[PDB]
Design a protein around this motif. Sequence first.
Motif, PDB file in Angstrom:
ATOM      1  N   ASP A   2      -7.797  -0.241 -16.361  1.00 27.10           N
ATOM      2  CA  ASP A   2      -8.351   0.524 -15.242  1.00 27.10           C
ATOM      3  C   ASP A   2      -7.291   1.457 -14.657  1.00 27.10           C
ATOM      4  N   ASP A   3      -7.723   2.605 -14.154  1.00 21.72           N
ATOM      5  CA  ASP A   3      -6.757   3.479 -13.494  1.00 21.72           C
ATOM      6  C   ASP A   3      -6.365   2.851 -12.152  1.00 21.72           C
ATOM      7  N   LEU A   4      -5.073   2.876 -11.824  1.00 21.81           N
ATOM      8  CA  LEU A   4      -4.604   2.279 -10.578  1.00 21.81           C
ATOM      9  C   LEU A   4      -4.348   3.370  -9.538  1.00 21.81           C
ATOM     10  N   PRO A   5      -4.981   3.290  -8.361  1.00 28.01           N
ATOM     11  CA  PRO A   5      -4.596   4.281  -7.346  1.00 28.01           C
ATOM     12  C   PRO A   5      -3.179   4.059  -6.831  1.00 28.01           C
ATOM     13  N   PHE A   6      -2.625   5.036  -6.102  1.00 32.36           N
ATOM     14  CA  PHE A   6      -1.228   4.948  -5.663  1.00 32.36           C
ATOM     15  C   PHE A   6      -0.889   3.666  -4.925  1.00 32.36           C
ATOM     16  N   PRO A   7      -1.705   3.254  -3.935  1.00 35.19           N
ATOM     17  CA  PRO A   7      -1.251   2.074  -3.187  1.00 35.19           C
ATOM     18  C   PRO A   7      -1.094   0.833  -4.085  1.00 35.19           C
ATOM     19  N   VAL A   8      -1.907   0.757  -5.137  1.00 32.07           N
ATOM     20  CA  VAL A   8      -1.863  -0.396  -6.059  1.00 32.07           C
ATOM     21  C   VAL A   8      -0.673  -0.304  -6.973  1.00 32.07           C
ATOM     22  N   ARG A   9      -0.481   0.871  -7.566  1.00 34.29           N
ATOM     23  CA  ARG A   9       0.654   1.187  -8.408  1.00 34.29           C
ATOM     24  C   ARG A   9       1.920   0.809  -7.686  1.00 34.29           C
ATOM     25  N   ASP A  10       2.019   1.274  -6.451  1.00 35.25           N
ATOM     26  CA  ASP A  10       3.259   1.163  -5.696  1.00 35.25           C
ATOM     27  C   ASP A  10       3.533  -0.290  -5.382  1.00 35.25           C
ATOM     28  N   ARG A  11       2.499  -1.046  -5.005  1.00 35.84           N
ATOM     29  CA  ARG A  11       2.773  -2.467  -4.742  1.00 35.84           C
ATOM     30  C   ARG A  11       3.067  -3.271  -6.012  1.00 35.84           C
ATOM     31  N   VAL A  12       2.371  -2.997  -7.106  1.00 38.40           N
ATOM     32  CA  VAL A  12       2.658  -3.706  -8.358  1.00 38.40           C
ATOM     33  C   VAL A  12       4.062  -3.376  -8.814  1.00 38.40           C
ATOM     34  N   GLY A  13       4.544  -2.197  -8.449  1.00 40.20           N
ATOM     35  CA  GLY A  13       5.935  -1.879  -8.710  1.00 40.20           C
ATOM     36  C   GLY A  13       7.010  -2.675  -7.984  1.00 40.20           C
ATOM     37  N   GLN A  14       6.612  -3.437  -6.968  1.00 47.83           N
ATOM     38  CA  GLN A  14       7.516  -4.279  -6.203  1.00 47.83           C
ATOM     39  C   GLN A  14       7.771  -5.557  -6.973  1.00 47.83           C
TER      40      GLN A  14
END
Length: 86
Positions: free
Chosen positions: A58-70
């Motif tokens: 699934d495409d991840l919106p920015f807020p999701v991308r950014d938190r999964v990056g933590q």
Amino acid sequence: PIKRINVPEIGIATELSHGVVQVQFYDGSVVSVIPSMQGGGITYTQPNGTSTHFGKGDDLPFPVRDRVGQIPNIQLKLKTAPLLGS
């Protein structure tokens, strides 16, 4: 809950038995992932309580991308915590 550590500015990270790493951010948002699993998926809960599951394609919106990056930094910190109950 197998391990739990507070990470200033970031949130409270918990490692769960099923292999899930959950981070409760200090803004009230939550992200949960399965780092050992190539097909795992991501769950994300907004501060307002709305939660959404994202399957691996699934495409991840920015807020999701950014938190999964933590998560990778958070996994390093979880490694250094002892087991709950020890």
